[PDB]
C-alpha cells in the first residue's frame, strides 16, 4: 500500500522533477534527471499515444504516492462533480491533507510527512482527508522537539510557499482559504490526457 522503493527513478522515468527529494543538494548532482532508469536508459524510443497518456497519469500519481485504486476513485469523483473534470481531479488531489503537512513544511518529503502522520483543532491521521475552504490545519505540541520538523521547515523556507494558504511560525498553523484554480497549479500537467485515459 506504499511505494517504498528508490524515489529518483520515478522522476527519471517521468523525465521531470516531481519534487520527491528533500533538497540537501541538487537533483542533477543526485541523479541523471535527463536519463530514464535502467540498463536501456540512455535509449528513448517513440512512445505511443497510449504510452503518453499513461506517463501523464503516472506523473500525477507518483508525486503524491497515490496508488492506482485510490487514484481511479479520485477520477470517478472528479467526473461526478459539476464542471471541468480534469480541473476537479487536480482540485481533489490538492485538497488532500497529506500534501499539506509536506507543503506547510513539517516533512522533508511527502514520505517523511506521511511517517509524521490537526484540522479545525481536531486530530486527523488520514493522508486522504479532503481539507475544505476556511479550515485551519495545524501541528501538535507533543512532537515539536523532533529535529526532522526543524530541518524540514528550513527546506520549506527556500521553496515558493503556496499562494492560497497561510503557513505560520511557532504554533505552526494555516488556513485552507479556498480551493486552487487551474491557474494556481503548474501549466505542465496535461490533465486532459488523464481524463482521456480513463474514458478509454
Amino acid at each position: 500500500a506504499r511505494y517504498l522503493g528508490p524515489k529518483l527513478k520515478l522522476s527519471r522515468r517521468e523525465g521531470t522533477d516531481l519534487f520527491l527529494k528533500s533538497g540537501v543538494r541538487a537533483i542533477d548532482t543526485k541523479c541523471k534527471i535527463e536519463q530514464a532508469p535502467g540498463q536501456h536508459g540512455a535509449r528513448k524510443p517513440r512512445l505511443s499515444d497510449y504510452g503518453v497518456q499513461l506517463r501523464e497519469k503516472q506523473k500525477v500519481r507518483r508525486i503524491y504516492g497515490v496508488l492506482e485504486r485510490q487514484f481511479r476513485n479520485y477520477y470517478k469523483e472528479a467526473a461526478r462533480l459539476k464542471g471541468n473534470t480534469g480541473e476537479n481531479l487536480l482540485a481533489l488531489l490538492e485538497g488532500r491533507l497529506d500534501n499539506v503537512v509536506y507543503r506547510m513544511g513539517f516533512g522533508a518529503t511527502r514520505a517523511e510527512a506521511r511517517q509524521l502522520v490537526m484540522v479545525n483543532g481536531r486530530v486527523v491521521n488520514i493522508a486522504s482527508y479532503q481539507v475544505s475552504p476556511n479550515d485551519v490545519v495545524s501541528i501538535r505540541e507533543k512532537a515539536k522537539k523532533q529535529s526532522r520538523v526543524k530541518a524540514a521547515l528550513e527546506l520549506a523556507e527556500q521553496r515558493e510557499k503556496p499562494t492560497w494558504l497561510e503557513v505560520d511560525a511557532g504554533k505552526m498553523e494555516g488556513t485552507f482559504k479556498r480551493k486552487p484554480e487551474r491557474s494556481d497549479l503548474s501549466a505542465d500537467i496535461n490533465e486532459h490526457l488523464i481524463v482521456e485515459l480513463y474514458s478509454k
Partner: protein, 154 residues
C-alpha cells in the same frame, strides 16, 4: 501549424525481379483555431513519405467554424466505407474520439467533442469523413444569412 502523423503503411508492387516495397504516410496539419488539412505522401523511404504528406497537408487546408473549441451542432461525415458522428461537448470533456478522428480534431482546435466512427475505420477514409463532417458544419450566422433572419431569430 501543429502537425500530426496518423499512420505509416508499407505497401508493395510486384515486378519481374520480385517485390518493390514503399511507404505511405497520412498526416494532418492545423492552426488549432478552425483550420485543418490532411496530406497523403508516398516514397521509398519513411521520412520522405512523411515530408511529402506534410507538404500536401499545408496546401489543402479548409476552414471550420468552431464554437469555444467545440462543434456548432451534431454532424455526420461519410467517405468510402467510413461513417463518422461528432457531437458538441461541455468544457473538460476532452476529445472523446478514436485516434484518426482525434488527430484531426486536435489540430483543428476542437478541444471538447464526443465522436464515434462507424463502418470502416481505415485511417485514410476516416480522416476524409471527419474533415467532410467539419467543413459542412454551419454556424448560426451563415444560417441566419441564408434564411434572411437575425441570429436572435435563429
Amino acid at each position: 501549424l501543429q502537425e500530426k502523423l496518423i499512420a505509416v503503411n508499407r505497401v508493395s508492387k510486384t515486378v519481374k525481379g520480385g517485390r518493390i516495397f514503399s511507404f505511405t504516410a497520412l498526416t494532418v496539419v492545423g492552426d488549432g483555431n478552425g483550420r485543418v488539412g490532411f496530406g497523403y505522401g508516398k516514397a521509398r523511404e519513411v521520412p520522405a513519405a512523411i515530408q511529402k504528406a506534410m507538404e500536401k497537408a499545408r496546401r489543402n487546408m479548409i476552414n471550420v467554424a468552431l464554437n469555444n473549441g467545440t462543434l456548432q451542432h451534431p454532424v455526420k461525415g461519410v467517405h468510402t466505407g467510413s461513417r463518422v458522428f461528432m457531437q458538441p461537448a461541455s468544457e473538460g470533456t476532452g476529445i472523446i474520439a478514436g485516434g484518426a478522428m482525434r488527430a484531426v480534431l486536435e489540430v483543428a482546435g476542437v478541444h471538447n467533442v464526443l465522436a464515434k466512427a462507424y463502418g470502416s475505420t481505415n485511417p485514410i477514409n476516416v480522416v476524409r469523413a471527419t474533415i467532410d463532417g467539419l467543413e459542412n458544419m454551419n454556424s448560426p450566422e451563415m444560417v441566419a444569412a441564408k434564411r434572411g433572419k437575425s441570429v436572435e431569430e435563429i
